[PDB]
């Protein structure tokens, strides 16, 4: 509640709508701003869908070779486009989705958990009544305001990310695989990672979509402290609106100061 003025000032400085939910897993203190408003989740689902994949499949089964065609390649598939003729190991596809945001890898991940419907079913089983998953990449980025397809809230997303990365949604060995996939990726450098102090460590998953949608979700580790789970979502009124990574980094600075 104390941070509401700071977040509203960021909305004005960046002409955007901002959704924030952060929870300190050691104290249960939360920071929330518009945390119940819907945004298109865009590529942030890839971290959670990787969690669902790990929950439903053994570590050894990540060695299965999955194949696809040139026709299957959707926009922004920098890893999968290099391996059409040979296929890739399932674990490498999941890693490509989380690390590089490869969209064809995201669709294969969807396929392996039952499509958008299967992803939604898995989240409902974890107690998430909010997230709505309907479409594959790249149509899921359409982000029409008022259209609930492929949307969630900062609170719902953060709660799911907490379950997978710190909670009891996964066994410890798979939790480690997921958090490692989330660490050290360039797609996160200008977002939450840019807004935390230099002695903090961030494992994140970024997202971007239409209507200026720009998101980042993360598990962050301060020094000598329990992790903090952060979801920052943002969007704008106009379909062709730009986004500004600095909004997410600035929102992160407010969270850091409060926590």
* Chain residues that interact with Cl ion, rule: CB under 5 A: 34, 36-37
For the CB of residue 250, give the shortest distance to Cl ion in the complex, in Å: 20
In the set 43, 100, 101, 234, the catalytic residue is 43
Nearest to 216 by CA among 183, 253, 184, 190: 190
Pick between residue 39 and residue 110 the one whose CB is nearest to Cl ion: 39
Which CA distances in Å does 17 have to 89, 194, 251? 39, 20, 12
Pick between residue 7 and residue 221 the one whose CB is nearest to Cl ion: 7
Pick between residue 146 and residue 223 the one whose CB is nearest to Cl ion: 146
In the set 8, 139, 180, 238, the catalytic residue is 139
Distance CA 87, CA 54 (A): 20
For the CB of residue 155, give the shortest distance to Cl ion in the complex, in Å: 8
> Largest Cα–Cα distance in the chain?
55
Q: Gaps (C–N > 2.5 Å) in the chain: which residues precede them?
A: none
For the CB of residue 25, give the shortest distance to Cl ion in the complex, in Å: 22
Pick between residue 155 and residue 175 the one whose CB is nearest to Cl ion: 155
Residue 39 and residue 152 in contact, taking contact as beta carbons nearer than 8 Å: yes
Q: Is 152 a catalytic residue?
A: no
Pick between residue 36 and residue 226 the one whose CB is nearest to Cl ion: 36
C-beta nearest to Cl ion: residue = 36
> Can you read off the two tokens belonging to residue 160?
């799911």
Angle (CA) 154-167-192 rounded to 5° is 40
For the CB of residue 37, give the shortest distance to Cl ion in the complex, in Å: 5
Q: Which residues pair with 22 in a beta bridge?
A: 31, 230
Distance CA 97, CA 219 (A): 17
Nearest to 56 by CA among 83, 107, 101, 94: 94
Q: Is 139 a catalytic residue?
A: yes
For the CB of residue 35, give the shortest distance to Cl ion in the complex, in Å: 5
Q: Catalytic residue numbers? A: 43, 139
């Amino acid at each position: 509640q104390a941070t509401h003025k700071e977040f509203s000032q960021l909305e004005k400085k960046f002409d955007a709508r901002l959704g924030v939910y952060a929870i300190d897993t050691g104290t249960n203190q939360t920071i929330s701003y518009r945390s119940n408003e819907r945004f298109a989740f865009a590529s942030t689902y890839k971290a959670l869908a990787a969690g669902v994949l790990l929950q439903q499949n053994s570590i050894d089964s990540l060695n299965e070779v999955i194949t696809y065609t040139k026709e299957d390649l959707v926009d922004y598939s920098p890893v999968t486009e290099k391996h059409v003729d040979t296929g890739m190991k399932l674990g490498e596809i999941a890693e490509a989705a989380v690390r590089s945001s490869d969209n064809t890898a995201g669709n294969i991940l969807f396929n392996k958990i039952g499509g958008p419907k299967g992803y939604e079913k898995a989240l409902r089983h974890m107690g998430d009544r909010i997230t709505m998953s309907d479409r594959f990449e790249t149509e899921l980025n359409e982000a029409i305001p008022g259209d609930i397809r492929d949307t969630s809230t900062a609170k719902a997303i953060a709660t799911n990310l907490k379950a997978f990365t710190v909670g009891n949604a996964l066994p410890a060995e798979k939790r480690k695989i997921l958090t490692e996939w989330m660490k050290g990726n360039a797609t996160g450098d200008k977002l939450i990672r840019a807004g935390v102090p230099t002695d903090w460590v961030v494992g994140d998953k970024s997202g971007a979509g239409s209507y200026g949608t720009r998101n980042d979700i993360a598990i962050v580790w301060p020094p000598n402290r329990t992790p903090i789970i952060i979801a920052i979502l943002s969007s704008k009124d106009e379909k062709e609106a730009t986004y500004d990574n600095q909004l997410i980094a600035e929102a992160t600075e407010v969270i850091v100061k409060a926590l």
